Every structure is written in C-alpha cells, then in structure tokens.
Amino acid sequence: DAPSSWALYFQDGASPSYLGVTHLNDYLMFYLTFIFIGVIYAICKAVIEYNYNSHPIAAKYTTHGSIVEFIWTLIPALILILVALPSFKLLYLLDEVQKPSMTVKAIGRQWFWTYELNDFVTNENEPVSFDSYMVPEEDLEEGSLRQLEVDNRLVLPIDTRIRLILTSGDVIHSWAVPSLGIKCDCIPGRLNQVSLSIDREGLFYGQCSELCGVLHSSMPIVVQGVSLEDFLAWLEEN
Amino acid sequence: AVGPVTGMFKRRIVTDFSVTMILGTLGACYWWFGYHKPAARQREEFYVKLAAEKN
Amino acid sequence: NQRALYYFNEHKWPIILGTWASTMGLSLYAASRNRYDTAPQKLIQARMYAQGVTVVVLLGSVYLSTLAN
Amino acid sequence: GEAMIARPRLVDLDKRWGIMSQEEKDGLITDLYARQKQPWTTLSIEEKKAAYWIAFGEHGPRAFSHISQKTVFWGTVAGLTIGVVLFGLIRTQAAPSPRTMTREWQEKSNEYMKENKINPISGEASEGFKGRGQISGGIFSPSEK
Amino acid sequence: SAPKPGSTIPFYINKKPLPTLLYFGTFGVIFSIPFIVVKYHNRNL
Amino acid sequence: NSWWTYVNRWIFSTNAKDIAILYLLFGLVSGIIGSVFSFIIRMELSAPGSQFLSGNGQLYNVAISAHGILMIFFFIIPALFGAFGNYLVPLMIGAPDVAYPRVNNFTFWLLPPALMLLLISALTEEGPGGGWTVYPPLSSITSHSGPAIDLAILSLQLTGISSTLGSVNLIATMINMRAPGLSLYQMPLFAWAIMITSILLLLTLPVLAGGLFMLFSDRNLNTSFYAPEGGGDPVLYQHLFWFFGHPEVYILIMPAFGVVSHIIPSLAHKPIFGKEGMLWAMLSIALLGLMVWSHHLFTVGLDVDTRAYFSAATMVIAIPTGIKIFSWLATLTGGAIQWSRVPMLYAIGFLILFTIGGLTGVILSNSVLDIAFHDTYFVVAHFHYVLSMGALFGLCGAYYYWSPKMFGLMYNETLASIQFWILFIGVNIVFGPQHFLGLNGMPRRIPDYPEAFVGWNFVSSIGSVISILSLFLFMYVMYDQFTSNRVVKTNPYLIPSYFDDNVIFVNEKLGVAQSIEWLLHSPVHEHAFNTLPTKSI
Amino acid sequence: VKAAAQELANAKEPSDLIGPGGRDGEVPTDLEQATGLERYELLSELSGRDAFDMKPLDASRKGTLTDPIMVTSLDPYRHIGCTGSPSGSHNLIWMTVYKDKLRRCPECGSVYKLKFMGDPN
Amino acid sequence: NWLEEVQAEEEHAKRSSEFWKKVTYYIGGPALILASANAYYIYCKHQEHAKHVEDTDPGYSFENLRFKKYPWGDGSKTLFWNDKVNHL
Amino acid sequence: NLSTKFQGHPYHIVSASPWPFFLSVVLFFNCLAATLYLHGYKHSSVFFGISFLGLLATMYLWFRDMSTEANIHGAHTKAVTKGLKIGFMLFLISETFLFASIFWAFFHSSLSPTFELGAVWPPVGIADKTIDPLEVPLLNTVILLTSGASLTYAHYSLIARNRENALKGLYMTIALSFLFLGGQAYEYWNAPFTISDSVYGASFYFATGLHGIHIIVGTILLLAATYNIYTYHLTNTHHNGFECGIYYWHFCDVVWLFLYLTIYIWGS
Amino acid sequence: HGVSLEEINTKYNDFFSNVQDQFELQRGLNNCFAYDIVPSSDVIEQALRAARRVNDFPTAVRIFEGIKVKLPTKEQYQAYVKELKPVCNELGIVLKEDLF
Amino acid sequence: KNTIVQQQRFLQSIHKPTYLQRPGSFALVYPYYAVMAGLGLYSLYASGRVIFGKKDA
Amino acid sequence: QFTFGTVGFDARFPNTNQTKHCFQSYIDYFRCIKAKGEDFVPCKQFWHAYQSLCPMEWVERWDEQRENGTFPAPI
Ligand code: HEA
Ligand code: HEA
Ligand SMILES: CCCCCCCCCCCCCCCC(=O)OC[C@H](COP(=O)(O)OCCN)OC(=O)CCCCCCCCCCCCCCC
Ligand SMILES: CCCCCCCCCCCCCCCC(=O)OC[C@H](COP(=O)(O)OCCN)OC(=O)CCCCCCCCCCCCCCC
Ligand code: CUA
Ligand SMILES: [Ca+2]
Ligand SMILES: [Cu+2]
Ligand SMILES: [Mg+2]
Ligand SMILES: [Zn+2]
C-alpha cells in the first residue's frame, strides 16, 4: 500500500483492477526473461569462440540464408500472439460498465485536491465537499509518513462499486493510486470516468503523476476503506 | 588418401543453439515456478484466512 | 422520382470527391498517348479539368439542395 | 646461387631485423629468393628459418599495436575509486537532513504501520515480518543520541 | 590548386606550452555556464 | 594576410566535408552543457529534502527542460545525422560534393544563434518550466507570464528550419549524383539509413512547426486553440506534437544502425549477412513508425477501440527491428574477430544495451500495463537505456572509427579503452536502480520524494559522478590526438590474409578496400574525384 | 553537325566558347546564347562524341596478363569497383588502378590496365 | 534529323498555344464577367446596413477574448479592426 | 584537345558565398526583435522594421549570385538543371505536409464541438453573421482558375519561339493574381468576426493568411521570370526559372481549391 | 544456392593442377580454405607440387599450418601428416612444428 | 538591343569572386556590412536588456 | 436514512469521455420543467442525473449565465 525500503517489485494492493495488471506482467516477464538470457548468452559466446587468435580463417562465402530467415520472422510472431491474446481479453473485460452504487468527484485544483459527494442530497440539503492539503513537515504526527500524509483523507466503503469522475480547474493533473491500480488524467473541460472497488480495510497512498508547475511534489492522495457502519457514521458527521 | 573432411560449421552452430535454448528455458521455468506460484499461494492463503477470521 | 433527387443532396460530398478523382484519373489516362508533352505538362491539364468539373458540380449541388421545402 | 650463405648473416634474424638498412634488407631478400630456386633438399635449416620469418613474419604489414589489458583494468579501477571518493567529498557540502531521518522515527513509523494494517500480506503488517521495513539502515538512520 | 594536405585540419592551432592553457580553459567556461545560471537564479530569494 | 584566408576557409566556405567538422565540434560543445545540467540534476536528487537548490522548484523544472532540449535537439541530431551525414555520403556514393553547396553552409550556421537564444531564455526571470515537451495549459500566459517560453519556441523553429532544409539536399544528392554504373538498390547501408532519416524528417517536421506556432500565437495574438474557455481542447496539442515526437525517436537511432552495420563487417573480416533483409527491415520500420504515435496518450482517456488498435500496431514494430539484431549476430559467427579494437568494443556494447532497452519498451506497450508505469521512472529507465546507450555508443563508435580519416592522426588506444569501460560501468550503474524505482511507483519530475526511495537514488548518484570522469577522459584523449603527430596509413583496417606473403601483399595487394572512402589519402583531398569512379554494370 | 564539329575542333582555351548571338524581336535558342561548360556539352552531343567520361566498367570477358581490360582516365589513377564474371559473381571490391601498372583483383584474378587519355603536364 | 524534330516540336507547340489562347479568350472571359455581375447583384440585394445590435445575447462567453493586451493601438484592438461592422 | 582544359564531371563547383553567414544572423535579429516587440519594450519597433529590410536585402543579394553564375559563368549544364527541379519538388512536398496541420486543427475543433459552443459547429450567434460562398469567394476562385489557362498559354507561346504572346500572357496572369489578392484583402476588411473570437475565426484567418503569403511568393517569382524574359536572357529550351514557377502556381491553385471546398462550404 | 562441396573439391583439384603464378596460387589457397571443407590428400598433393613448381617454400609450410588450424582434432591432423610423409621427405619440406 | 553576347564576353575578363565580379559592386556590399554591424551592436544591448528585465524610461 | 442510488449505464455515452453527459442532463431537466409543470415527479429524475456528474463549479456558472440570458443553448 505504501513504498518500502530497497523494494524491487510491485507493492501489495487490493483491487480487481489491480489483480489483473500484476498477473499479466508476470506472464509477460515469463516470455521476456528467456529471450533476454538467450540473446545475451549468444552474443557473449559468439566472441569467445571466434576471436582472432582462435579462428584466423574467416567464412566469407556464407552470407545467405532462406530457411533461417523464415524462422526468424515466424517465431517472434507466435510469441507476440501468445502474449497479446490475454492482453486484449483483459482489456475488454476491464473496460466494460458495471452497475455503480455511488459517485465521487475529485476536482484537481492547483496544489490541492477537492473531493465532493452529492449523491446523498436529500432534505438534509448538505452535499459534502472538502479539500485535501498536505500536512507540513513540522506538523507531522509522530511516526507519520513524510510527503505522503494529508489532513483530510478520502473515505470509502469496501466491497461496493464506486464511479470516480475527474476534472480540473487550472492545468492538467492526474489522479493516481498504484495500490488500487488507478491512473487517469484530469484535463480542464472534460470529465474522465473510472471504476473503483476497495477490497481490504486499510490505507492507500498515491501522488499526482503529471507536473503542474512548482509544487508537483506536494499533492498526495490518501484513500481509506472502512466498513459500511463506519462510512455511515463518517457521512453523518459531515 | 584420407578423403575430404567436412561438416564442422554446422556442428558448432547447432551446439551453440542447443545450449542457448536450454539455458533460456531453464531460466524462464525457474522464474515462473519459483516466484509467481508461491506469491499466488501466499495471497490466496491470506485472503482465505481473513475471510475465516471474519466469523 | 423525388427519391433519387433527395438522395443526391443526402450525400453530396462523396460524389464531389469521387468525381474529382475520376476526372483526374480519366484525363491523366487519356493524355498519356502523345509524344511532345512532359509529365508535369500532362498532369497540369488534368488538374485544370478536374477543378473546372468540381466547380460546376458544386454549383449544381448548391442549386439542387435548395429544394428543402 | 649454388653456394650457402654464411651462418652469422642469418642467426636469430628476428631481433636483428629491427635495426638494419634498406640496402641490407633488399640484398638479403634477393639472395634468399635466388637461392630458393635450387631443390629444397639442399637448403640449410637456418636458411629455411630465415625464409619463413621473412615471408610469414611478425613485422611489416602484420605488426599490430599491443594493448596491455592489465593497464586497462587498473585504469578503470582507479577511475571508479576516484569517482566514489569525489562523490563522498561533495556529499558533505549539503543542507541538514530532515527531522524524519532518525532511527527512532523510523522505528516509530514501523510500529505505527502495523496498527493501521499497511501492507498486510508481505510487508510491515504481515504475520511474522522478520524484515527491515522502513529502516534503510546505514548512514540513512543515524540514531540520535 | 593541387597541394598535399599536411595531416592537420582541426579549426585551430595546438602547441604544448601556451595553447594547452587556452584549450583546457575554454573547456572550463562551457562546463561552468550552468553553474552561472543556477547562481543567478538564486539571488533575489 | 592569414586572417583573410582563414575567414574564407572556415566562415565563407562551400566545401561539404569542411563543414562536417564544424557540426561535430558544435555538437560536442552543446553535449558538454547538457551533461553538466544532468550532473546538477542528479546531485540535487540524491537525498530526501532540499539538498543543494535552496528550496526552489521552478529552477529544477528549468534544469530538466533545458537538459532534455539541449541533449535531444542540439547534440545527437547535429553531431550524428549532420556531422557524419555530410562527410561520408558524397564520398561513399562517389560524388564530387553535395548537390547544393551553400545551402548546406546556411543550414549549419543557424545553430549558434539558436543556442544563444535558448541560453538567453534560460537566463530570463523564470525560464522554460514545462519539460522538454511544453504543454498548452501549464505553458500559457497565465502561469509563465514573461518572455521566457517565447524564445524557447523560436529556437526550436530555427532548428527545425535547419533540419528540414538540410535534409532536402541530401536526398537531391543521393538521387541524382551517383557514380556511373551504381544503382539506388546497391548503395551502402549507411547511405540508405541517412536517406530514410531524411525522408522522415522532411515528412514530419512541418507538423510540429505548425503546432508550435499555434502555441506561440495562443500567448500573444489571443487565439484560443488550446484554451478550453474559448472552445479549444488542450489535448489537441498532444496529438500534433506526438505525431512528430515518435518519428523523431527513429531519426535519432537509425544512423546508429548504419554505423554498426558498417563497423561490424569491417573488423570481422566477413560480409554482412543478408543485406537485402536489412534494407527491407529498415524500410518497414520507417513506414510503421508513422502509424503509431498515440501510444503516448494511453491515460488521456481515448475510446477503447483506439487504444486497442494503437496497442496492436506498436508490438508489430518488434518483428522487423528484432530481425536486424539477429543478422548482426549471424555476422559474428564464423568470421575472424578483433575484439580489442575500440570500434568493435563499442559495436558489441551497443547490442546488449539496446536489446535490454527494447525489451523494456515492449513491456509497456500494452494499454492495460501502461497505467502502472506511465509517468513513472520506468519510462525514464527505458528511454535513457535506449538513447544514451544505442545512440551515444553509436556516435562514439563512429568517431573512434572514422577519426583517422577526417583528421589524419591516430589517437591512443589504452586511454580509449579505459574511457569505454568507465562509461559502460557508470551508465549501467546509473540506470540500473531506476528500473526498481519506477516499478515501486515513484513519479518523475519531482525534486523531492517520499522517505522510502532513498537507497536506489543514493546508489545512482555515484554512477552519475563517474560518467563525468569518463567525459573528462574523452576530452583529454581528443586533445592528445591532435598534438601527437602520429601519421595514419591510407587504409588502416586492411590486414594480409592467412596465406598472403609479406612482400606480395606490400607490392601487389595494397590500395584495396570495401568502401570508397578508404581509397583516398588519410587527410582526404579538397577537390577529390576529378574523374568519377566506375562500377561493373 | 559539320559546323558544330568544325567549331569545336578549332578552339584553344575555354575563353573562346562564345556563340554568335541572337537578334532582337525573337527569343534566342541554345545554339546561339550558350557559353562555358553548357556550350561544351551541347557541341559534344551534337558532334556525336561524349563530352564527359561516364562509361561503366566492362563486365564481359575476363582479364589476362597478355590482354587486360582498358580503363580510360584523365588522371594517373582511376578508382574501379570490380564484381568479376557477369555481374553478380563475387562480392564487390573497390580498388585503384595505378599508372603503368597492372591491377589484379584479389578474388577473381581479373587484370585491368590504365589508358591515360589526358595531358601529362 | 535535328531540323525535322525541331520543326515538328515547334509546330505542335504553336497549335497547342493557339488552342489555349482560344480557350482563355472564349471561355475564361464570359465566366469572369458573369461572376462579377452576380457578386454585384447579390451585394446590392442586401445593402441595408443597420448592423447595430446591442445586448441581444452579448458576449456569449466566447467572443472577443483578451488573454494578453495587443501591442498596437490603445491595447485592446485587432489589426484589421473596423468601427463600422465590428461592435463591442 | 580541348577536353583536358575542362573538368571531368558536369556538376557545379562554388566558391566564397559570404551570404549564408549573414542570413542566419538576420534571422536571429528578426526573432529577437519580434520577441521584444510583442511584450512591449521601449525603442523596439524600428528594430523590427530594419531587421525585415535587412532580411529582404540579404535574400536579394543571395539570389543575384545564382543569376550571375547561370547567365555568365555558364555552369548550368544538362545535369545541374535536374537537382534544381528535384529540390523544388521536395520543398513542395514539405509545404503540402505543413499545410495539413491547420486543416487538422480545424477538423478536430469542428467534428466534435464542445458544449460551450452549443454543440453545433458554427458557434451559436456566429452562425447568422457568416459570409456567403456565392459571393466574392466565387469570383476569387474563378479568377484563380482562369489564371492557369493564361499561364499555360504564355509558357506554350514561349516554347514555340514567340515573344509578344508570352509577354501578353504573363501580363494577364500577373494582373489576375493582383486582382485576386485585392479581393481577398477586401473580404478581410469587411468581416464581422475578429481572429480572437471563438475558434472559427482563429482557424479561418490562420488558414487564409498562409495561402496569401504563398500566393505573394508565387507572384514575385512570376515577376522575376517576366523580367528575365524581357532582357533576352531566357532561351526556348532552357528556362528553368520559369518551369520552377509554373509548378508553384499550380500547387497554390490546388491548395486553394481544397481550402475553399472545405472551409467556406462545409464548415459553415 | 548452387554447387555442392564434392564438385568444389574436384574443381579446386583441377585448378591447382595447372598454375604458374605465385599470386594465382596464393589466391587459390585463400579461397579454398574458406569453404568449410578441407580437401582430400590428392588436393594437398597437387598444391604442394604447384608450390614446388613456383619455388615458394613458405607456402609449402603454410599449407600444412592451415590444415592443422582448420581440423578440429589432433588425431585427424596426425593421420593427414602420416599420409603425406613420403612426399615431405621427397621434396624436403619441413613442418612448422619441427622448425621451431 | 541584344548586348547579351558582348557583355557575356566582357564579364569573363574579371577573376574576382562571384559576389564582386560585376563592376561597381562594392557600393551595394560595404554599406550592407556597416548596416549589419550596427544591427548586431544593437542586438547585443537588446539581449542584455532582456536578461535584466527592464524597459527604457 | 441514506440509500445508495445513482445513475446507471447509458447507451448514448458508453465511452470513457462523459463531458456531454452533464450538459445533456442539465438541458433535458430544464426543458422538462419548462414543459408540463414543476410538480411533475418523473422530471425530477433528470435532476439527480445532472447533480451526480457536474462538478458543481459549472452548475453555478450555467445558472448565472441563464439569469441574464447569455446561455449558449435554446433553453
Ligand atoms: C531512440 C529512442 C527510442 C527508441 C528506439 C524507442 C523504441 C520503442 N519504444 Fe520508446 N520512448 C522514447 C525513445 C525511444 N523509444 C522516449 C524518449 C520516450 C519518452 C517520451 C516522453 O518523455 O514523453 C519513450 C516512451 C515510450 C512509451 C510511452 C510509455 C508511457 O509514457 O506511458 C512506449 C509505449 O509503448 C514506448 C515503446 C517503445 C517500443 C515498443 C519500441 C521499439 O522500437 C523497441 C524495439 C526493440 C525490441 C522489440 C527489442 C529487440 C527485438 C528483439 C530482441 C526480438 C524479440 C522481441 C520480441 C519477441 C518482442 N517508448
Ligand atoms: C540523447 C539524450 C539524452 C542523454 C545523452 C541523456 C544523459 C543523461 N541523463 Fe537524461 N533525459 C533525456 C535525454 C538524455 N539524457 C530526456 C529526453 C529527458 C526527459 C526530460 C523531461 O522529462 O522533460 C531526460 C531526463 C533525465 C532525468 C529525469 C529528471 C526528472 O524527471 O526529474 C535524469 C535523472 O537523473 C537524467 C540523467 C541523465 C544522466 C545522469 C545522463 C548522462 O550522465 C549519461 C552518460 C552520458 C555522458 C556522460 C555524456 C558523455 C558524452 C560524450 C562521451 C561525448 C561524445 C561525443 C563525441 C564522440 C563527438 N536525464
Ligand atoms: C511567418 C512564418 C510562419 C511559419 C509558421 C506558419 C504559421 C502560419 C503563417 C503565419 C501566420 C499567419 C497569420 C494570419 C495572417 C493574417 O492575415 O492575420 C489577420 C490578423 C488580423 O485580423 P483581424 O482580427 O484584425 O480581422 C478583423 C476583420 N474585421 O492579423 C493579426 O491578428 C496579427 C497577425 C500577424 C502577427 C505577426 C507577428 C509576427 C511575430 C514574429 C513571428 C516569428 C518570426 C521569426 C520566424 C523564424
Ligand atoms: C513561407 C514559405 C516561403 C518562404 C520564402 C521562400 C522564398 C524562396 C523560395 C525558393 C525560390 C527559388 C528556388 C529556385 C531557384 C533556382 O532554381 O534558380 C535557378 C535560376 C537559373 O536560371 P536559368 O537556368 O533559368 O537561366 C538560363 C540562362 N540561359 O536562377 C534564377 O532564376 C534565380 C531566381 C531568383 C528569384 C526566385 C524567387 C525568390 C523568392 C521570392 C520570395 C521572397 C520573399 C519571401 C518572403 C518569405
Ligand atoms: Cu498536480 Cu503534479
Ligand atoms: Ca531532494
Ligand atoms: Cu513512442
Ligand atoms: Mg502523462
Ligand atoms: Zn574481382
């Protein structure tokens, strides 16, 4: 959910949209590692075994080939098809539309996010909206994560489809959370749509991924999944 | 007359190709059966343990 | 008829592009049968003929489209 | 050329060939060519040695520049050492580090991430988690005292 | 116009004693321009 | 007076081969500044917090933007496509000189003023603060309210003029002024690569010119092309720019393909394997480089079908390129190899690093996977591992291969090998850990980062330091080459065959070569080719 | 044709290549207002000969020590690219045919000899 | 030989040039005057002017944008601005 | 033997040419002066004008040398007069690709109108204050179409060794080009929408100004050609400077046809 | 794709049978030991006889040097030298490994 | 009115570079050099003004 | 008290882009209330459709524009 020290591979996440990306990446790496090792070994071996002091006589009359070239052109095609089939099945499965039960808005202002929910508008007449500001270093609570903590963090329920609508007001921003495998661009004038579904009950961190000027490094994103009762209590508070 | 001797380039090329293919297959198989499957097992075990604990 | 006439103005752009291309090709093919005419000289006449035919058909289409009553 | 050449004119020609004059070289090669038309069974062993050295020698067209790989290795090692030392020397001319780069704060963060259940599979909130977590260690965690 | 090139056409002259200072000095200015930019951007803070 | 002769020779010149040296030296001069800017960037980005720049963000943005522009527009293209595209093509195809002798000089002399304009821009109140690809909304008058980003666009327009006007006379030269008996299909592979790069430049540059002028007018003449308030779409600029952005990442690389193709067989004593295959692979890559440009816009939110197609037409490029690699491998198996020579060292080092970069590129071609790597350090690792390892290494190999012909002096070998090894190790260590940093999810273009991305950056800074020592060593060896007085033969890369005698070779087999440029004297004459060479019909 | 050949024959220096000139009221033709190299090419083409030497190499036949292939040149050398027996035999190899010396191909053994159709000094 | 080819080429050029002169003098002429007359007629057909409408849905939020003031004139005027047809 | 006193190859050898070093400097002056002027720096309007005059002067001085070398030195042989056509064809291709960027911008802004424009391409309000394509534009296109016939007549008359007709045809072509430019300027000065008005105007003016510049260049080329003819310089079989302007004129004609077909009729 | 390798052997035997030029012999040998095939003992017989005819002892030794280089195993080279020993004694040529 | 041949012959007696070959060409060259020198001298000062943002007043 | 309910899938706008959804919902709702009557219950549905998507920073601008009569739409 948060970066570790000296980490190598992905970080633990919880989302159906995140369980596919990592699996596809492992599948693709399975094919790519073999090619990498084979090519490097062949390149290294072709020189040790044919160096000048061992093979003075060159085979200058063999600069042709008609069966080797066909295999060269064919085998990579098969590899590409094999890798491609899941990469399309997963894409089209993921892009389809479910039946969302809630909606949120994540307007990306200049150097702070503005979250809004208007679904619950009723005789209460209090649509909920707030702004997320990065906590300064001096104000950090003991043990907190520097450069990744916010005063107000988005709160959502788990095991419930959510539809995120993203836009901006000043420049091009990007809402990005790797733990949930979400990355979309907020462009001023158009509403981008994304699907989201929390799975565990934890905290998830992220940062904006499109430079917006001088404070591109101080727009953290924090999502907290809580049970239904906790979400209802939190909503009633606001 | 000891007769002509030929068929040297093919032997060397075939040997190099075979060893390269063996090494590549070994590496890929180790990657797929040494990292991915244990990770999937751990994730499934954790999720089932959480679900059981929920009760 | 009154149906093909409505079809004409229902699709007036593809017919214009098609007739321009057809005039270009027809003129280019017809002119490729002489001796003292360099290739650019041959292409220039095709350009002129195509432009003229396109202009006349554009005027015709503009006149025809008026029947929107 | 039916008479053999004197022995001293051909002994260890490899080293002597380095310092000579064009006249002597031309005379020697032409004499060898003249004496090579007789049946080879009558040629002295030293004459054959000299002829082979002159023909398929290690001079003239085939005399390549030698590179001592030992020197290359030692030069690369020295360059790497100088680079590391220079980086270390210009590292101590920077601003003071933040207040969250202390081993105590790292330990507090490691303990705090377990309460909130962050990375609860193979991270700081796992079951056993005998790993490091957020303590990068070394000079990156100068435990305050 | 049929001369034999002298085996040198480098856009300048190089000797040991004096020109070596100029060759390696001009290298310093190009190496230092960005430092000048950085220093000039941090004077009105 | 020597002043008049000097001015006539070097400023009012019209000799094709006497302008290439100017291109090379200017490219090197710009590359020095680019490398120093990169060194500043990497020293700042070592440890968490504000280390060296006193808590400034605009300065860092200026640094990255200037570094990218300088090292992609003023260093590789002029020092590789122009420096070696003018000196060798007329010689290689067997022509007296370029078709238009003074248009080439005019094309060259547009660079110094452009560099001066860019420096003045970087020295203004704020400077370019939108990266090497300025984007409309962040780079409009609202944010950058000064005459800082206007100059940086005029400089790019001037460079585009120079490139698109110097890429026309090359085509007009290789079409009309070939040696008798030699056909287009039989030209050397390097000339074919230069032709293809010229075609791509000629086709794509004006689109970027138009887009950049639209952006420039949007700040001063009150147009509303990229303003969502007036009725425009800020995403149009992305389309217009990246329609040229990709066809420019093939222009950069292809001359390296040609250089390696001409370096391998020469020092391997074996003809290239399947020349027609390589020619057709190059043509296919060139053709397919124009139909895939929007794969840089996967997260913008295009409809599903467009993403699916643009992801299907990006993997295909991996078929032809791959062929080329195999061919070079097929060339090494069988022939005598002299691996100690510096050009061979660079040629071999090119293959491994470029193939790693290309595989990493294939990783992030799928639309599904790109969401986990877009605008992270994985992209930085990929494109650096391709550019600063396949283009820079190709450039260094070409220089160390053809320097004795241009200048007529032989450099030192031990120092060249030491420099190569230092550069190899340093760049590998620099760009290794960035892969892990990107994988873990650390964005790019941030002077500061979270607390857990420290180890890998601290490791990479050391290599970033070492590479500068490599550059210093290269400068010293280049200097020592000019003041050593080491004559070089006509064709230094000719050695007697296995059975060739030491006198028969001397007096009956000299003056032979597999390319024309190795027949002329070492400091090639001025008015060469009084009578054109002939080839069997 | 005869007039062009006669005019070309009787001329000492390149400065003597000037046409008779045209007349006012009508456009002038190339035969009367061409000077320098252009007039040289025009006159040589009209006369039936070749102005410049751009004839490809003689692929047919194989050279021999007693019957070499003649390569004409205006200079004491001329670079030639040998391909051997009917074009396509062996790989292309470039070489320079020195004056008064026989250039023998290192692969197919063909022999070429220079013909100095030019001014010694 | 040369004379015959030159004569034939000149004859062909003369015939084609005469044809094109006839085309441009007998086809391209009447159309020009007809088009000019049509333009004059349509222009006269609506010579009413009175193009002074104010407050009728003014601005619309996408007309007369001022991001940066112009350098010429006072600072808020275009190049070919006209005070008889263009209103603010 | 006169052959030994000449060169072996037909290509051209040039010397000196100090103009390339000055054109780049003048361009630098122009760019800097424009940047200064647009932001309103004192004492920076005369700079721009003097820089433009310098640019024109240097370009004229350059183009004088080519005429001197081709009409006196006699260095334009049978082969050197083919690269001068291949280069022009390549330049025309480059301009053709440049001209498509503005069309792409127009199409992207038109096919999918934004909500603020009312969802209809012609922005609400601006629809009723457009220009009739059955007006001055039709006269302009007819003029540009009938100019080509005059140009072809002039060229063919020149080939057939006739002087009066060639000059007459060039006169008519230049006059018609001037009339077209005047009509375009008149239409510019009587439009009810400025450049900074939505995107429709910002695209219309942007697409028309480039064509205006191109046609001005073509007219200057034709003027140079006619002046060369009048001096008894161009021959009947070697008139490269004329065949190099014919192509430009006809390319401009085709581009105008496409522009009028798209912008005036469709996008309105 | 053309001629096999057996016809190559016969062709090179025929070529080596008749040659009277040092350059010819050297280029023929250069092009022969590059075809992946080491000729039979008859071809070496003819090559050595030709070398004797043109009076070039160094080539007479270099032929055996190349035979040794191209062969993959020591036993085959030993058999080769054994087969051609009587000619070596007759002509007086000395193998490289024995000279020094 | 056809002096083409006469001047063609005359102008070939001058060996000066092609941009000075025609008689009376210095008048159109040296003033141009002076103008360019003045423009460059002003350009340096203009760039200096731009760097230190300031408009004359 | 709180019930989860929002706008479901719509065939007209299946793509990722949804810029036109809010605009269409707004226009349709206002046309709806213009006809029939303000008390029409089904009309109210469009209300929610145009409140769950529009960022609420545009709805105020549209209302302010519609006040005077500068709204760039028929209604
Ligand atoms: C010379 C420069 C260069 C070259 C050659 C390439 C080559 C490739 N590039 Fe890249 N790229 C860049 C320079 C380059 N690139 C730059 C500068 C950026 C960042 C721009 C920015 O900052 O906005 C970038 C960004 C970039 C992105 C954008 C990612 C994102 O931002 O989200 C993508 C997406 O697919 C991509 C893919 C590729 C592919 C598929 C190739 C292919 O051409 C690679 C071909 C090579 C191989 C395929 C390996 C060799 C082949 C074999 C060994 C055969 C076997 C292979 C298989 C079976 C697959 N690169
Ligand atoms: C050719 C292109 C090129 C080259 C060579 C380089 C070289 C280097 N680059 Fe960079 N870089 C880019 C193109 C290049 N780069 C681009 C396009 C971006 C994106 C900018 C943006 O986001 O807008 C970028 C961004 C970029 C970043 C990301 C910054 C950020 O996002 O915050 C970093 C981080 O360290 C970096 C570091 C380096 C380092 C340490 C080197 C060097 O140390 C590598 C080693 C090279 C040398 C030491 C040079 C040696 C030179 C010679 C030996 C001369 C040879 C000459 C002859 C033979 C004539 N560069
Ligand atoms: C020049 C090279 C360009 C190369 C790239 C191609 C770009 C397209 C072509 C050029 C732009 C044409 C615009 C339309 C022309 C027109 O006629 O504009 C018409 C409009 C006026 O209309 P109005 O609203 O008054 O009408 C009202 C009707 N009632 O004038 C303008 O507002 C200003 C346009 C000219 C501004 C010139 C500024 C130049 C700055 C320097 C440029 C860089 C020089 C250095 C280059 C190396
Ligand atoms: C925005 C895009 C446009 C930018 C402007 C580009 C302008 C330059 C375009 C190139 C034109 C010349 C190419 C052909 C040269 C050639 O081939 O000349 C070859 C001929 C040879 O004569 P001959 O062999 O016929 O004589 C035969 C005797 N027996 O010499 C000439 O006639 C020189 C002609 C000079 C005039 C050309 C037009 C100059 C440009 C006008 C516009 C200037 C303002 C531009 C403002 C931006
Ligand atoms: Cu918002 Cu970076
Ligand atoms: Ca930092
Ligand atoms: Cu790309
Ligand atoms: Mg992005
Ligand atoms: Zn041969």
Tab-separated table of C-alpha atoms in Angstrom, chain I residues 7 22 33 62-63 72 103-104 107 115 121 128 136-137 151 163 168 185 205 227 232 252 257 266:
chain	number	residue	atom	x	y	z
I	7	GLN	CA	36.745	19.394	-65.603
I	22	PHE	CA	24.590	36.738	-42.793
I	33	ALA	CA	13.154	41.887	-32.284
I	62	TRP	CA	21.977	35.926	-52.496
I	63	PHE	CA	19.626	35.463	-55.437
I	72	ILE	CA	27.548	34.415	-67.425
I	103	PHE	CA	-6.628	21.594	-41.547
I	104	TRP	CA	-6.181	19.018	-38.781
I	107	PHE	CA	-11.275	19.338	-38.294
I	115	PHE	CA	-20.582	22.224	-25.025
I	121	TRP	CA	-20.095	23.512	-35.275
I	128	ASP	CA	-26.040	34.160	-38.599
I	136	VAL	CA	-16.552	37.363	-53.571
I	137	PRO	CA	-15.128	33.868	-52.853
I	151	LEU	CA	-0.056	30.937	-67.661
I	163	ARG	CA	7.785	36.891	-77.890
I	168	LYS	CA	0.993	39.266	-73.004
I	185	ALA	CA	-7.964	41.889	-48.725
I	205	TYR	CA	-7.775	33.647	-40.676
I	227	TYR	CA	11.784	40.451	-66.200
I	232	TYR	CA	16.681	38.434	-73.846
I	252	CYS	CA	-1.195	27.065	-54.937
I	257	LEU	CA	-9.429	24.658	-54.342
I	266	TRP	CA	-18.708	22.618	-45.431
